[PDB]
Every structure is written in structure tokens, then in C-alpha cells.
Design a protein around this ligand. Structure first.
Ligand SMILES: [Br-]
Ligand SMILES: [Br-]
Length: 263
């Protein structure tokens, strides 16, 4: 219903905390007043979306008018996956068809996958952080509506992994590792860090070929492992899949540093 649609729109609006909406006058926009359509014209979708929301989120506006605008926003966005659309248009600054499709793809994927699989999808995206935060909001919204505990497990599990990537992206300690790499790309190093987290069953054999994957300059292969131990020791607990995952990873790097010292 329209009545519950407004509530879902406001519920989605509280998941995002767009300053765009708060900065907005509303008073002097002229939206008051009442039967409205597309008076906005030339105005970009993202801006009409935020402006409508500014009214929906209003502390003084009557619920009768909020309903009229709610239906209108539902026409602007597509009736299918409008929730995701709303979250996208508010969540992303420069939102283009490449982003809309990607976000939609990532979401349908989540609704049927490791932390690298997720990173590799969002890797080359403008405001990739933002694109990812959209899916997180969407999934956490859906979670409160799921019947199946199996769905609940899958859904919450993805939320953890997506937030994990968000934490990984938010860091800049790899500068010294990026320095010693041939390609000098942050993403190639970042990919490797995620692989070590993915490889819960970390083997001495696998870990030993780590500077070869990231193409670390010759001789500087031991130093790499020293920086790696330093890196994993520095990470927040949220980054690890298990409590013993830190302790085991650091043991392994230490075991490898010790093995290389004789050869
Ligand atoms: Br179940
Ligand atoms: Br699962």
C-alpha cells in the first residue's frame, strides 16, 4: 500500500544519511504545493530524488502530502527494484548506467561468492566505496523482511564480507608493500591481502609464492614478508574470518620468514 510505501521509503531514507537531503532548503524549493508531476524538468534524477526525500523526511509536512510525493518518486524510479534504485540515486554522487547495472548485478548475485569475488566486481567503479555501501543498505533492509533462517544466514554473511571489503578499502598501510612491487598498483596488493584472508587453510607452500603473485622486486622478497607480518598484526579484528585467523596468519608468515633465512 501507499501508506506502508511511505514508511519503507522513510526506512530506506534512514539507512542512507545523505547530507544532500539535510543541506536542502525544501522551504524555498516551492514543493509546498498540491497534485504534482515533473515541474523539475532539466533537473538530474539524483537531485529530484534527494529533493523529494527532503520533503518525505520533513518534520512539519503533513502525511497526506508526503503520500502524494511518495507515489510520485515511485513513478520516477522504476516500480521494479525501486528500493535499490532509491538507495543508488541517493548513495552515489556520479550515478551513471554502468553503476546502476553493476549495483543491480551485485544485488541479484547476493540474492541467489567470496570476499575477493566481491572486490573484483566493484574494483574498477567510480566511488566504488559508495556503490558497495548501497548493496550493504539494501541487504540490511531486506534482512528485516526475510522468513528463512537459511536466507538470513546467507544475507547477514554477505553483509559481514561487504563491510570487511569496506574496511580493507578504508586503509592505507600498504604504501611500503606497493613500493617494493613491480606493477606498483594498490589493487594488486589489496587482492593478495584478501586472498590470505580467503585462504583460512593457509599453507606454507601457498604463502611462500606470495611475493611472486604481487611481483615483488628481486632480493626484496624477505622484507615483503616482514611488511606482511607488520600489516596483518596492524589490522582490526573485523578483517579476520575467525579469532585464531590472525594468530595463524602471523605464525605462517613467521614460519616462512624463518624458512627463507636458511635458503
Ligand atoms: Br530456515
Ligand atoms: Br549461506
Amino acid at each position: 500500500t501507499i501508506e506502508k510505501l511511505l514508511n519503507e521509503m522513510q526506512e530506506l531514507l534512514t539507512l542512507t544519511d545523505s547530507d544532500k537531503i539535510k543541506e536542502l532548503s525544501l522551504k524555498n524549493s516551492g514543493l509546498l504545493e498540491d497534485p504534482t508531476l515533473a515541474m523539475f524538468g532539466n533537473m538530474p534524477k539524483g537531485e529530484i530524488v534527494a529533493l523529494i526525500s527532503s520533503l518525505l523526511q520533513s518534520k512539519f509536512v503533513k502525511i497526506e502530502l508526503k503520500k502524494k510525493y511518495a507515489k510520485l518518486l515511485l513513478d520516477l524510479l522504476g516500480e521494479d527494484d525501486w528500493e535499490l534504485a532509491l538507495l543508488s540515486w541517493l548513495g552515489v554522487g556520479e550515478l551513471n548506467q554502468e553503476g546502476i547495472q553493476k549495483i543491480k548485478k551485485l544485488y541479484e548475485k547476493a540474492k541467489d561468492a567470496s570476499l575477493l569475488d566481491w572486490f573484483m566486481e566493484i574494483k574498477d567503479l567510480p566511488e566504488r566505496e559508495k556503490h558497495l555501501k548501497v548493496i550493504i543498505r539494501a541487504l540490511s533492509f531486506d534482512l528485516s523482511y526475510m522468513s528463512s533462517f537459511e536466507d538470513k544466514v546467507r544475507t547477514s554473511s554477505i553483509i559481514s564480507d561487504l563491510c570487511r571489503i569496506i574496511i580493507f578499502l578504508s586503509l592505507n598501510n600498504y604504501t611500503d608493500i606497493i613500493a617494493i612491487s613491480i606493477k606498483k598498483d594498490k589493487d594488486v596488493i589489496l587482492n593478495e591481502m584478501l586472498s590470505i584472508i580467503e585462504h583460512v587453510w593457509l599453507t606454507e607452500d601457498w604463502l611462500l609464492e606470495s611475493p611472486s603473485r604481487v611481483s615483488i622486486v628481486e632480493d626484496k622478497h624477505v622484507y615483503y614478508f616482514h611488511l606482511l607480518k607488520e600489516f596483518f598484526a596492524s589490522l582490526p579484528d573485523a578483517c579476520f574470518i575467525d579469532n585464531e585467523q590472525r594468530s595463524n596468519t602471523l605464525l605462517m608468515i613467521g614460519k616462512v620468514i624463518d624458512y627463507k633465512e636458511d635458503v
